[PDB]
Amino acid sequence: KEVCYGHLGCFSNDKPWAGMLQRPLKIFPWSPEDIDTRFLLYTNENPNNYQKISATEPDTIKFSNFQLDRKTRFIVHGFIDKGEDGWLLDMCKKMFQVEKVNCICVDWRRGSRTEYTQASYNTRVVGAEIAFLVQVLSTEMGYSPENVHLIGHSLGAHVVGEAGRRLEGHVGRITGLDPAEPCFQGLPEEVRLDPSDAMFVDVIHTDSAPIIPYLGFGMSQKVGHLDFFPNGGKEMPGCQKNILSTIVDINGIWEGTQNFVACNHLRSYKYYASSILNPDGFLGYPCSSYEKFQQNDCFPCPEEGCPKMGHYADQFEGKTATVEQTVYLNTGDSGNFTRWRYKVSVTLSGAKKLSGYILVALYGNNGNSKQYEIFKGSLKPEARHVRDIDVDINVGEIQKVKFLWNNRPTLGASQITVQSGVDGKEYNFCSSDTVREDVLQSLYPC
């Protein structure tokens, strides 16, 4: 059957829209009136107070500060944790710091603040609302959908995915921030976010552990041209893991009646926010798997460069070469979350075989790093060891490195190579010395 809502078309309840394993209930999405989608426009000139725009009343747009010669980015919410109500506008403000943009925050709280399955179905109508506004801008004002970027978090990722399908995949870009798993993962492409929804789709996965039994609200399934899995995509540094327990009560979670640490689910947008100002701190390395990446493979950046996770992912050369490209990287646990990966190779030197740990610190014109463990076990002179480390600072031009070992024997590194990921640049350092344990050995350019 289907309910029709005027200019937003009809909404069917048969397969695959409803009556499926992931969504058995055959109810219909609420009316546009009951969802009350609100398009709140903010621009560099009006960053504090919004200008409500309506596709059905074109004058709201004509009289607004919407600039036809600027890109447009829609930001759509989903799960809203206590105190995070203002994350959409916060995101717009960060964008304002680096670009001129029409930032439209999509508020559909009346439609989302209800039982989960209902909210999930309501995404269809919010998606139709977005598609219609984009269609008005395009057909009536000559503003191409190519200038439009739809950012959707949680349930909002499927809202934007629906908008894209309606636009026949012509919207410029869609960014899915930890797309909601319950009621979407495993279903046909027509009912969820997928690569065909936009000319370019990038996804950040941050809470991809199964909702049952792990309480991971995000999708593990790949749904973009680029699918980023920072820190593995299931557990983020700095976030308390959720207690492994009985079905969820996916609705109790959604509606705040059940305990749930939303930290991992929200990290997706937290990383996006930071990537706006610090994209160089989020270089992503395409790789067949996270374990492979963690085993020091898929480094340095490939010939096409590394896609920068977040805001600047659209700059990636191979962004649409294929779909479901897995991209990995690790982040910090707080603040900017930025990291700079370096492949460190150490060739040991000395007269005695020892047992212990070897560490290396990097020194550059931008500053120096802390010491990082490269290897632990038997330390044999002339043996070479390699480890890719995620440093919390960009040292810039590496001018020297320091070697340190621990558990009056002496040990040293005759040569250490440090390769930066961005361009594969190898810096070599050399020394003919050896030091006692817990003493820093400096190695200079060679």
Ligand X SMILES: *[C@@H]1O[C@H](CO)[C@@H](O)[C@H](O)[C@H]1NC(C)=O
What is the C-alpha separation between 29 and 12, in angstroms, rounded?
9
The single residue of 225, 265, 311, 385 carrying the catalytic annotation is 265
What is the C-alpha separation between 342 and 299, in angstroms, rounded?
9
Annotation says 385 is catalytic = no
Helix (H) or strand (E) holding 428: strand 426-430
Determine whether the annotation assigns residue 197 to a binding site: yes
Which is nearer to ligand X, 25 or 277 (by Cβ)?
277
The single residue of 107, 178, 202, 227 carrying the catalytic annotation is 178
- Least distance (Å) between residue 340 CB and ligand X: 10
> Any idea which residue has 């070697």 for tokens?
403
Which is nearer to ligand X, 24 or 367 (by Cβ)?
367
Annotation says 202 is catalytic = no
What is the C-alpha separation between 367 and 405, in angstroms, rounded?
22
Residue nearest to ligand X (CB): 277
Determine whether the annotation assigns residue 192 to a binding site: yes
Which is nearer to ligand X, 95 or 411 (by Cβ)?
95
Dig out the tokens for 198 from the structure: 């936009």
Which is nearer to ligand X, 32 or 279 (by Cβ)?
279
What is the C-alpha separation between 73 and 88, in angstroms, rounded?
11
CB 44 within 8 A of CB 119: no
Classify residue 168 as exposed, middle or buried by CB count within 10 Å of its CB (0-12, 13-18, 19+): exposed
Q: Tally Cβ neighbours within 10 Å of residue 423.
A: 11
The single residue of 112, 154, 268, 349 carrying the catalytic annotation is 154
Helices 87-96 and 263-277: angle between axes, nearest 10 degrees: 20
Q: Tally Cβ neighbours within 10 Å of residue 45.
A: 9
What is the C-alpha separation between 204 and 227, in angstroms, rounded?
6
- Least distance (Å) between residue 334 CB and ligand X: 10
What is the C-alpha separation between 351 and 226, in angstroms, rounded?
49
Annotation says 154 is catalytic = yes
Among candidates 180, 202, 189, 3, which has minimal Cα distance to 77? 180
- Least distance (Å) between residue 184 CB and ligand X: 33
- The residues binding ligand X (CB under 6 A) are 277-278, 335-336
Which is nearer to ligand X, 270 or 385 (by Cβ)?
270
- Least distance (Å) between residue 88 CB and ligand X: 19
- Least distance (Å) between residue 273 CB and ligand X: 10
List, as residue ranges, the binding site: 189, 192, 194, 197
Q: Which residue numbers are catalytic?
A: 154, 178, 265
List, as residue ranges, the binding site for Ca(2+): 189, 192, 194, 197
